[PDB]
């Protein structure tokens, strides 16, 4: 998921520009659904909901626009329960045995022969939350005669979520948006970025429901198992359930028992930009890093950023420097619309030439004792534009290569907090053979796929609608794309088809701004409104996405009625 | 008396218009169902823990989601144990009035479309006559709502929770 908030300093107009780009499911009940809710004297909101949800999760009204990216902040913890001897369903709590509440559940199950019979079992709760089998995590973590494990998710006690989106839907300015977020501290697992009408600043925050443990506490409460499995669950409180001092703490401004207080959660206001591409709060703005928040929100500059994050911020800086090929130096609605689809490839732009220089002279190789001719591969990649546009040639070769490069000792210039966009870098000359190995494999995979090495991306990356293949653009975050069109399909099994259940990709997109006339919004729902192949709204929106034609979504009453495809109907019923 | 005007523009984007929250729910639930009935109907089987009854215990979830694709039997157990009547009650008990109405309207709106799809039409030929296309309750929507909050915690450990058993 990506999002940008630009302030009036960046846009050079009366209001800022909001870019909302959740990368999400293309099928299933969590998929997005675009709609507008006009309630008399109450709300006029437009944006998107998960199927089955009744309020707008990402979108805009007359006054504010916002989006969400998944946040690095851990939302759960484990609790090691010391069982009572002879009584494996009871755990000790400060010396006294406490019984786990049972629930006997019966589920009807259809049998492979047609008949329907019951399968039954009895599951359990601790006071922390449901019991959890962790043998899969590690064999030694099995619910033994001596020890058992429970999981807690602060959102389990979080009931303020629907209200919060409901109130945002009604919110009348950025300051009101901010205050609702601060009041409710409810946002379950996402970052938030917002822009308001006539407000110079853009808003970033990871304010929501987040487990509350002290550094002092984690030093005293992490069990030997918690220590042993700690790296597989980074920043997850694996605490001792036997000691009550290990219970999640509650600050003086903490909205919910066991959650973090509102003032100790990261937020930032900038008149230039805030952005996030799934890395921690740290780099909401590159020029003004955020530091000094609880460990649980994730690394604040102690980790390399992902390639996508490096691509994201780079795009934002180079836009404002006016060095990206686009007009002017301002992040205007129109420019942002083009910019976020440009399909730049960080790994290519930064490392292609070094790789090509390192392994392409000469281009006939010995790989695992075998003669490999890589002249065509080398030449096609040299000629390629480092982009994943519909007519970029060789982009898929790069995908199959880069995702296979071993990352151990790949870069010679390590990550530096001082330079998070350009570090790590420096392709290791000692990796030459492994890189040749990876490239050899890539040439073979493309070979099996039946695509030429120089095939235009549009013929490899596609969505099928009405029997026809719509050429697509973009790729996966691993290659350092910002524009995400990320197939789960192996290249050999008919190219990068988006017809299955692809990986988190561009889904609902929006560019929202606030000129003097009122809120303007340009949108995509890439997979289209309808999951029914018979529906005329199964593939229309996808056609537009393929063509790169943003939809200006009507918002006012005159806009809705003035639309060239306007049809209205009325549904009514008792109660 | 629920009543909403549905305005459709380019790409089918619906624009619900109502005088109250319940009726907005009524329109929104209707259009979502109108466009996405098969996914939605499958989804309520998921949240209720009624998947194994219709689709078999060993079959995986049809669609990917924040739930992943665990086996039906385990998903069923997870949802019943974690999104239990008590949890749904506790959820509902903490809601403002207008939202409770919206959800009522949403379920009734969704239910309107189910009745329409059962009656006929060439929409949703994939599932329109299957037993699991069936009316839902305000509480079932609340199940769905509660489930979307668990993405960062319990959802990731569905199989694991449904299999937590003493020696």
């Amino acid at each position: 998921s990506n999002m940008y908030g630009f302030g009036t300093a960046a846009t050079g107009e009366g209001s800022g520009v909001l870019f909302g780009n959740p990368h999400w499911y293309w099928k299933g009940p969590d998929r997005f659904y675009q709609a507008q809710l006009t309630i008399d004297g109450e709300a006029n909101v437009s944006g998107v909901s998960f199927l089955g949800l009744p309020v707008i999760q990402i979108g805009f009204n007359d006054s504010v626009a916002w989006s969400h990216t998944v946040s690095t902040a851990r939302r759960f913890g484990f609790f090691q329960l010391s069982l009572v001897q002879g009584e494996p369903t009871s755990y000790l709590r400060d010396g006294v045995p406490v019984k786990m509440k049972p629930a006997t559940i019966t589920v009807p199950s259809r049998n492979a022969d047609g008949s329907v019979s019951d399968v039954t079992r009895t599951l359990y709760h601790s006071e922390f939350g449901p019991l959890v089998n962790l043998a899969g995590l590690n064999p030694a973590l099995a619910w033994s005669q001596g020890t058992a494990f429970a999981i807690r998710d602060i959102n389990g006690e979080n009931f303020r979520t629907l209200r919060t989106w409901m109130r945002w839907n009604q919110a009348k300015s950025l300051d009101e948006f901010i205050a609702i977020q601060k009041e409710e501290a409810s946002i379950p697992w996402v970052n938030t970025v917002a822009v308001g009408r006539g407000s110079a600043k853009a808003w970033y925050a990871d304010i929501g429901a987040v487990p509350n443990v002290s550094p002092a506490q984690t030093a005293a409460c992490t069990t030997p198992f918690g220590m042993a499995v700690g790296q597989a669950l980074p920043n997850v409180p694996f605490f001792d359930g036997s000691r009550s001092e290990c219970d999640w703490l509650t600050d003086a401004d903490s909205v919910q028992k066991g959650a973090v207080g509102v003032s100790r959660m990261p937020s930032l206001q900038r008149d230039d930009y805030v952005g996030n591409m799934n890395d921690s709060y740290w780099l909401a703005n590159v020029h003004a890093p955020l530091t000094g928040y609880p460990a649980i929100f994730g690394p604040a500059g102690t980790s390399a950023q992902t390639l996508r994050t490096r691509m994201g911020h780079t795009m934002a800086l180079e836009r404002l420097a006016g060095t990206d090929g686009y007009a002017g130096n301002k992040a205007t609605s129109a420019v942002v619309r083009e910019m976020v689809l440009g399909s730049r490839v960080f790994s290519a732009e930064r490392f292609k030439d070094e790789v090509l220089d390192l392994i392409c002279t000469p281009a006939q190789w010995t790989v695992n004792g075998a003669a490999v001719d890589a002249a065509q591969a080398c030449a096609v990649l040299a000629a390629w534009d480092n982009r994943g546009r519909k007519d970029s040639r060789g982009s898929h070769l790069w995908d199959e290569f880069w995702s296979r490069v071993p990352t151990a000792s790949l870069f010679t210039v390590p990550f530096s907090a001082a330079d998070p966009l350009n570090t790590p870098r420096g392709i290791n000359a000692a990796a030459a053979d492994a890189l040749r190995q990876a490239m050899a494999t890539a040439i073979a995979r493309v070979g099996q796929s039946g695509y030429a090495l120089d095939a235009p991306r549009g013929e490899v990356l596609y969505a099928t609608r009405g029997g026809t293949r719509l050429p697509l653009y973009g790729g996966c975050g691993a290659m350092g794309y910002f524009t995400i069109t990320c197939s789960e399909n192996d290249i050999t099994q008919g190219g990068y088809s988006m017809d299955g259940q692809p990986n988190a990709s561009n889904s609902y997109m929006q560019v929202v701004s606030f000129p003097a006339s009122g809120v303007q919004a340009h949108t995509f729902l890439t997979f289209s409104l309808s999951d029914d192949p018979a529906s005329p709204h199964h593939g229309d929106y996808t056609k537009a996405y393929s063509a790169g034609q943003w939809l200006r979504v009507p918002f006012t009453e005159a806009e809705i009625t003035g639309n060239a495809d306007y049809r209205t109907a009325t549904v009514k019923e008792l109660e | 008396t629920y009543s909403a005007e549905i305005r459709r523009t380019t790409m089918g984007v619906p624009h619900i218009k109502a005088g109250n929250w319940g009726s907005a729910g009524y329109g929104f639930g209707y259009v979502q169902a109108q466009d996405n009935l098969c996914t939605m109907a499958d989804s309520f089987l998921t949240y209720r823990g009624e998947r194994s009854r219709h689709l078999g215990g060993s079959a995986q979830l049809v669609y990917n989601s924040t739930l992943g694709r665990p086996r039906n039997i385990d998903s069923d157990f997870f949802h019943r144990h974690v999104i239990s009547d008590e949890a749904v009650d506790r959820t509902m008990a903490a809601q403002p009035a207008k939202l409770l109405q919206m959800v009522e309207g949403f379920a009734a709106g969704y239910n309107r479309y189910v009745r329409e799809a059962k009656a006929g039409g060439s929409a949703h030929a994939a599932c329109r006559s299957e037993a699991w296309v069936q009316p839902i309750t305000a509480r079932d929507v609340w199940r769905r709502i509660y489930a979307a909050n668990l993405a960062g915690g319990y959802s990731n450990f569905a199989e694991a929770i449904a299999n937590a058993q003493p020696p």
């Binding site: 499911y25 998944v70 995590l137 030694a140 042993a228 799934n278 | -």
Partner: peptide
């Protein structure tokens, strides 16, 4: 406890 036997679960919502 053998760290070699640890199987880390996916913790990225949506990944």
């Amino acid at each position: 406890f053998e760290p070699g036997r640890t199987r880390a679960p996916s913790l990225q919502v949506g990944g």
